[PDB]
Amino acid sequence: MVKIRLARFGSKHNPHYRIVVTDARRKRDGKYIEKIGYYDPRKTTPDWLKVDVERARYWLSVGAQPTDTARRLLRQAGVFRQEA
Amino acid sequence: AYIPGEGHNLQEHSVVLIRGGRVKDLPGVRYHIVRGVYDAAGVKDRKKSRSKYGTKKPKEAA
Amino acid sequence: GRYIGPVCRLCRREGVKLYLKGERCYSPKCAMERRPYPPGQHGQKRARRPSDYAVRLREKQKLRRIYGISERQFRNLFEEASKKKGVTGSVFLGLLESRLDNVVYRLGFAVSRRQARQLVRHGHITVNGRRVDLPSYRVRPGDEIAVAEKSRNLELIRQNLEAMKGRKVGPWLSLDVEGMKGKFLRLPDREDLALPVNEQLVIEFYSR
Amino acid sequence: RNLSALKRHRQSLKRRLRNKAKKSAIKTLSKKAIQLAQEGKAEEALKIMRKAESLIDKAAKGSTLHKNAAARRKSRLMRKVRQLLEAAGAPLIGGGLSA
Amino acid sequence: PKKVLTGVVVSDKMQKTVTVLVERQFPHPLYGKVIKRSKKYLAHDPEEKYKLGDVVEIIESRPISKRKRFRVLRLVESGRMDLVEKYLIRRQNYESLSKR
RNA sequence: UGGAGAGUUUGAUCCUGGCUCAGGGUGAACGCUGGCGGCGUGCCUAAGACAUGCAAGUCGUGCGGGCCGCGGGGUUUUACUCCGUGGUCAGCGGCGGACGGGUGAGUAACGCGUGGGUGACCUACCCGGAAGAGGGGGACAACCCGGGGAAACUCGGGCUAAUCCCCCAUGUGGACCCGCCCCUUGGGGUGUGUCCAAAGGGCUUUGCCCGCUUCCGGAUGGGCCCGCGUCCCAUCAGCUAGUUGGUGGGGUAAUGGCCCACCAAGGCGACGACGGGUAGCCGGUCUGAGAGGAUGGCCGGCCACAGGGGCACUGAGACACGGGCCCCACUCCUACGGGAGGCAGCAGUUAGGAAUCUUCCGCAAUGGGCGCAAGCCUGACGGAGCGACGCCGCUUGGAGGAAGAAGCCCUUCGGGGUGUAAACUCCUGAACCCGGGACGAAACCCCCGACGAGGGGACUGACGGUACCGGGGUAAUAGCGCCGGCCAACUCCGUGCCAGCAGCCGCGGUAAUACGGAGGGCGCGAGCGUUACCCGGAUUCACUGGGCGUAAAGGGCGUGUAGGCGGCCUGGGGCGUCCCAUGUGA
Numbered sequence A: 001m002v003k004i005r006l007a008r009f010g011s012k013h014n015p016h017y018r019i020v021v022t023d024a025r026r027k028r029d030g031k032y033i034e035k036i037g038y039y040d041p042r043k044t045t046p047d048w049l050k051v052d053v054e055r056a057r058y059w060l061s062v063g064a065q066p067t068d069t070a071r072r073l074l075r076q077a078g079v080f081r082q083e084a
Numbered sequence B: 001a002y003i004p005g006e007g008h009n010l011q012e013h014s015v016v017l018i019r020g021g022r023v024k025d026l027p028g029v030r031y032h033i034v035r036g037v038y039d040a041a042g043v044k045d046r047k048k049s050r051s052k053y054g055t056k057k058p059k060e061a062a
Numbered sequence C: 001g002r003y004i005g006p007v008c009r010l011c012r013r014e015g016v017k018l019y020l021k022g023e024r025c026y027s028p029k030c031a032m033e034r035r036p037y038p039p040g041q042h043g044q045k046r047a048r049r050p051s052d053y054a055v056r057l058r059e060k061q062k063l064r065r066i067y068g069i070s071e072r073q074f075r076n077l078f079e080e081a082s083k084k085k086g087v088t089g090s091v092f093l094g095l096l097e098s099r100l101d102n103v104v105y106r107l108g109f110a111v112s113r114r115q116a117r118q119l120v121r122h123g124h125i126t127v128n129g130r131r132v133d134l135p136s137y138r139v140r141p142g143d144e145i146a147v148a149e150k151s152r153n154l155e156l157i158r159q160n161l162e163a164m165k166g167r168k169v170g171p172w173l174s175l176d177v178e179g180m181k182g183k184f185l186r187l188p189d190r191e192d193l194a195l196p197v198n199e200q201l202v203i204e205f206y207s208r
Numbered sequence D: 001r002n003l004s005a006l007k008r009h010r011q012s013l014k015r016r017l018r019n020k021a022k023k024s025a026i027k028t029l030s031k032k033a034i035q036l037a038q039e040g041k042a043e044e045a046l047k048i049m050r051k052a053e054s055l056i057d058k059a060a061k062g063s064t065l066h067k068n069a070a071a072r073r074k075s076r077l078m079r080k081v082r083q084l085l086e087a088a089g090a091p092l093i094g095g096g097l098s099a
Numbered sequence E: 001p002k003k004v005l006t007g008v009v010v011s012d013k014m015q016k017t018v019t020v021l022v023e024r025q026f027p028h029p030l031y032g033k034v035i036k037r038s039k040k041y042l043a044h045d046p047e048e049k050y051k052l053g054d055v056v057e058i059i060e061s062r063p064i065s066k067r068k069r070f071r072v073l074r075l076v077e078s079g080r081m082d083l084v085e086k087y088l089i090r091r092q093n094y095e096s097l098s099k100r
Numbered sequence F: 001u002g003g004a005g006a007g008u009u010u011g012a013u014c015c016u017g018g019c020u021c022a023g024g025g026u027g028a029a030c031g032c033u034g035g036c037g038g039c040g041u042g043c044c045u046a047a048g049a050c051a052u053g054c055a056a057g058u059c060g061u062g063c064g065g066g067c068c069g070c071g072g073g074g075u076u077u078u079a080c081u082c083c084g085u086g087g088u089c090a091g092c093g094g095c096g097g098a099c100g101g102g103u104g105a106g107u108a109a110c111g112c113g114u115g116g117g118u119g120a121c122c123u124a125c126c127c128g129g130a131a132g133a134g135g136g137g138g139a140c141a142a143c144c145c146g147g148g149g150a151a152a153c154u155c156g157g158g159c160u161a162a163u164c165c166c167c168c169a170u171g172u173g174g175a176c177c178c179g180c181c182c183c184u185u186g187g188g189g190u191g192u193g194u195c196c197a198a199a200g201g202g203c204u205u206u207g208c209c210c211g212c213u214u215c216c217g218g219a220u221g222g223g224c225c226c227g228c229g230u231c232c233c234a235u236c237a238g239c240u241a242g243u244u245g246g247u248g249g250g251g252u253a254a255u256g257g258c259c260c261a262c263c264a265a266g267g268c269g270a271c272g273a274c275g276g277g278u279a280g281c282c283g284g285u286c287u288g289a290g291a292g293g294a295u296g297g298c299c300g301g302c303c304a305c306a307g308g309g310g311c312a313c314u315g316a317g318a319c320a321c322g323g324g325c326c327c328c329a330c331u332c333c334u335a336c337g338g339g340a341g342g343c344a345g346c347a348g349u350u351a352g353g354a355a356u357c358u359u360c361c362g363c364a365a366u367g368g369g370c371g372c373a374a375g376c377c378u379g380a381c382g383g384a385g386c387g388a389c390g391c392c393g394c395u396u397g398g399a400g401g402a403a404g405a406a407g408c409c410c411u412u413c414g415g416g417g418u419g420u421a422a423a424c425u426c427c428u429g430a431a432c433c434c435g436g437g438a439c440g441a442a443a444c445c446c447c448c449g450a451c452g453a454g455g456g457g458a459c460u461g462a463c464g465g466u467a468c469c470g471g472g473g474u475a476a477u478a479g480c481g482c483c484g485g486c487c488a489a490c491u492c493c494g495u496g497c498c499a500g501c502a503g504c505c506g507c508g509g510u511a512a513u514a515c516g517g518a519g520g521g522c523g524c525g526a527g528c529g530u531u532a533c534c535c536g537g538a539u540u541c542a543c544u545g546g547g548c549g550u551a552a553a554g555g556g557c558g559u560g561u562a563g564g565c566g567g568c569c570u571g572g573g574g575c576g577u578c579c580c581a582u583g584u585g586a
C-alpha cells in the first residue's frame, strides 16, 4: 500500500530525510507521489522539521500508511491530536 | 612504431606498448613507443625530460 | 602545497616591491634597493619588448604572488568573481581580501602573509570565537578576528600588535590593538586599496 | 542448496490440477447446452445452460476464471442458445433467461 | 480530447474501409520555411457512403483493426477529385524513379 | 551580459584554401614522482567462463505431529500421558517471492520523449460506505508399515487437522440473455429468469481485538490505443499472403488481422517504403557568444534481458535472476549404478584488456516483507576497506639573517649569477603521546487515559573511543613539464646531417638559445606530463552565418512532371501567424 516514510538525502554522515507519499514498492529515494516536508535527525537547524498538515491528513483520509518511525514525527508534530 | 631517445634494448620477440603520434620524417609510421614498459627499458643516463624516455630519477650525491 | 623558498627573487622578478618579507621586503629592499633587476644569470642584460601576452602573464603572477596563493585556489576565485555581474575585476580583489590569512596580515597580527598562514594554520587565530585553522576561510561584514587564550600571549604576538600602534588600518577594517580583536566592516572597492596591479590586464589574461 | 519457497510451485500444481479439472468440465458441459439448443430440446438444454451458468459463476470464487470472463462466457453463451432455439425449438424454460 | 483531423479520400477498395490523406503546415525547426506533410489513415466507414474526393474529417477511436484506428466524422465538401489528382500522379510517377 | 585569435603556400603582396597550436571536458589510461583529510567515483573489454560464502523469508493470534525441554495430571516397571508454557525442527495452510539488486545484449520500434484517448480494462495489501458470516461432507502431507539407491532420493500401503477442499442454505448485492428508459461506441437505470458467496484463531473473554465473505466508491499501480518528435547508406527503389479490408468466431482484464475460417484485392513507398549498418531512449551531461555540436557513464524515470532459445503453470499481478518443463552448448559429483548447475545479485577467482576495488561491518539508523506484538530475514541500505581516478581543503614551516660564505655556473679574469636562499638565532609547532568523547536514537514497546488524544517511563550504535574537545608535543614529502617561433623562460660545453628533437614551420654540415648534460630561468605543485576521444577556435556544411568569370564549384542545350514561388481591389472563413487565459513541462 501507499506509505509515508523517510528518504535519505544530503550526504554521508549527514542525513536530511525528505518526508513523502509514494508506493511501498518504490525505492526509498525514488519517484514519490507528493513531498510534504523534511527532518534533520541531527538537530543542526531551526527548521529541522516541517509538515503540511492540511495536505498530510488528506492522504490519511484516502488511506495512507506511515512508518513506525515516521509516526513518531507525525504524532510528535501535532497532526494526530484529534481535539474537540 | 618509432623508438624514441638514444639506444634501446628491443630484439625480435620483445613485448612493447604503443603510444600514438607520428614522426613525419619517417613516412608510414604514426605510432611512438612508450619507454620503461614491458620489454622497453627507458633511456639510461637520461637526466632531462624523463617523463618520456621512461627513465627514473637518479641519485644525486651518494 | 603553497610556495616555499626564494621570495626576494620574486620581489624583483616583477620589478616591484611587494613586501612578502616582514622587515626586509620592507627594510632597505626586497633585496632590490641593492639589485632592482631580474634574477638568474641574465640579470644585468637589456630586456626584449615584452609581448601583449607576457605582459598579462607578468601582471597576473604579480597579483597571485602577492597573496601567495596557488594557481588552484586562485583561478577558482576569478571564475566565481567573473560569474557575478557588475565589474568582476573589482569584485575579484574583494574575494581576495576576504581570506582569513589576509585579514590577519592587514590587522597587523602578522607582518607577512606567509607568517599569517602559520598563525591561522596552527590555530592561534579566532573568528567570532571559533578555532579557524583554515587560511582559505572567507570572511564577511562584522566578523570578529581575535587571538585565542592559549595564544593571547607569545612574545611574538605582543610585538606585532605593538608595532600596529603608530600605524592605521584599512577604511574597511578596525583593530582593538589593546584587546587583540578586529572587525571586517565592508568589502573594499578598488579605491579602498591601491596596488601595482592593473586588474583589467588580469581579466584579459583569462580570456585566452 | 535452495529455498523452501519451492513450495509455491509444489502447491501451484494442485491449484493447477484443481482449476484445470474444474475447467475441462465447463467446456464439455457448455457443449451439452449448445448441442441441445441447436436441436430443439429447449427444456433439457435450458437446464444445462443454467448449470453451465453455475460452474461459470461458481468458478469466480477462486483464481480460475474471474473479471468479465464468466460474463463474456455467458454473454456469448445464453445469447448463442437463444439464437439456436430461435430456429424452431420454441422456448420451454426461461430458467436462466429473462425473455 | 480525442484527436480530430481533416483529410480527403483516395481509396474505397476495402469492404467498409476508406483511405484518407491528411496534410499539415508547420515551420521547419531549423530553416523556418512553412512546409507541408502527409499521412494516409485507414478510415472506418461501416455504411460505405463516402467516396473518392470527399474532403472529410476523422476522429481518434478505439482499435477497429490493425492499422485501422480512425472512424469518419462528417463531410466537408465532396466532389473534389482534383486533390486526388496530384496524389494519383505522385504514385503514378514512382514508376519512373525505379533504379532500373 | 555575450564573441580575441596565432603559425604554415611567395623574393615580397593581396586572396582562396587545407594542415597545426593556445581553451574547456573524461568512468580514463601510460610515464616520472607522491604526505594528509574530506566528499565523490572505480570491468567502457568477453551479455566470456565461474570454486566458496551471502544476497527473501515470515506467522504457534490458521492445524496435526517432532523430540526437547518445562512446572507438573495420575498410577499393573525406567516414567507415564496429562497439562500449560513453551522451545521449537520439519509437514499442512496464509502472505511475500512480480518489490528491492545487476546488466545494455537486443530493439530504429508506439521502445522513448511530449501531449491525449479507453462508452474497450485489471489492480492484492490500504481507506470509506452497505450487507453478511446458517448448517452438512471430504482429501493430502505429517505420522506407522513396504521397496529401490552411492547419492539425488523415489515410489508404494494405510490413518489424521484445520483460515485446506466440497455441498446446501442465505441473499444486502453482483453477474449475463431479452424488452424498456436515459445516455448514447458495451455508461447508468429498470423489469423479468436463471447463477453466485464466507473462516476461524487469540484474549487483561463475555465483550473487544486479529481475520472471513459480496457489493458500490477512494487511492495507488498498470495494460491497450492515438497525434507529433526520434541516427547512417538510394552505391539499399520497389515491399507484402494474414499480406490490407470484411464477415463470423476463438482469445484476453478488454480493443485489435492477436489467432482462426470465408469473402473481396487490397495495404506500403522519393514526405524514402523494403533492405543493410549503428544504437537501449529521456531528465540530463560536455562544449559553445549564440544557435548549434557531442554525449546518455554515476544519480533518477521508462524499456529490455537473467547461460542460448521455446513454453506454459501459479497468481490480483510473471510467461518470473536466486520458480518449473523441454532442446542446445558448457561445466561439476559419482562407490559411475546415475545425478547436478546457471554472479548481468554482494564480494572474490579466471580469461580478455592500456585499465577499473574488500571473498570487510552492521541491521544501530532508513526502506522492505511477514506478524497482535515482541521479534525475524534484509550483500536494499547505513558504514568501514582498496585506487592522487576526480573535485576540495591541508602540510613539508615563520621572522631575522651578508655587500651577500662554501660549491657549482658563466666571465672581457675587473666581475656577474644562483642568493635571504643556506647556514645561523629566536617563534610557532601538523603529526604523535594522555584524558575525555559524541549529534546520529526516537519510536515500536510499557504504565496512566479506552490500545483514541495526551502525558510519563524504558530500550537499542554498525560506523568506533571515530569525528570533535583539552593538554602535552617534534621544523617535519617535492616533484613534473617547458625556455628556436606560435609561447613565459639563455648561457657554457659536448656533438658535427652522426647521435638526436619534433603539434605545425623546422632544428643537427666544428661556434647549435631547437640534439645530449650542466648552470640559470619560465610554468605548475602532490602532483606535473603523455596518449586517446568530444566541443571550441573552424565563419572549415555558413539556420544565426559562405560560396560557384580566372582560386573547388552553372547541369552541353531545350522541353516538361511532381515540387517550391507568385501580380492590383473587395468580402466569407481564421489553417498558418499573434495576444490573453489555464493545464502539463516532478
Ligand SMILES: [Mg+2]
Binding pocket: A023, A025, A026
Ligand atoms: Mg512500481
Ligand SMILES: [Mg+2]
Binding pocket: A071, A072, A075, A076, F443
Ligand atoms: Mg508515536
Ligand SMILES: [Mg+2]
Binding pocket: C084, C085, C086, C087, C088, F001
Ligand atoms: Mg557581469
Ligand SMILES: [Mg+2]
Binding pocket: C206, C207, C208
Ligand atoms: Mg576564454
Ligand SMILES: [Mg+2]
Binding pocket: D061, F197
Ligand atoms: Mg469468496
Ligand SMILES: [Mg+2]
Binding pocket: D063, D064
Ligand atoms: Mg490466472
Ligand SMILES: [Mg+2]
Binding pocket: none
Ligand atoms: Mg594564419
Ligand SMILES: [Mg+2]
Binding pocket: F009
Ligand atoms: Mg605556389
Ligand SMILES: [Mg+2]
Binding pocket: none
Ligand atoms: Mg620563403
Ligand SMILES: [Mg+2]
Binding pocket: F017
Ligand atoms: Mg582556412
Ligand SMILES: [Mg+2]
Binding pocket: none
Ligand atoms: Mg586539449
Ligand SMILES: [Mg+2]
Binding pocket: F044, F297
Ligand atoms: Mg561510454
Ligand SMILES: [Mg+2]
Binding pocket: none
Ligand atoms: Mg567479465
Ligand SMILES: [Mg+2]
Binding pocket: F046, F048
Ligand atoms: Mg568470446
Ligand SMILES: [Mg+2]
Binding pocket: none
Ligand atoms: Mg513466540
Ligand SMILES: [Mg+2]
Binding pocket: none
Ligand atoms: Mg524480480
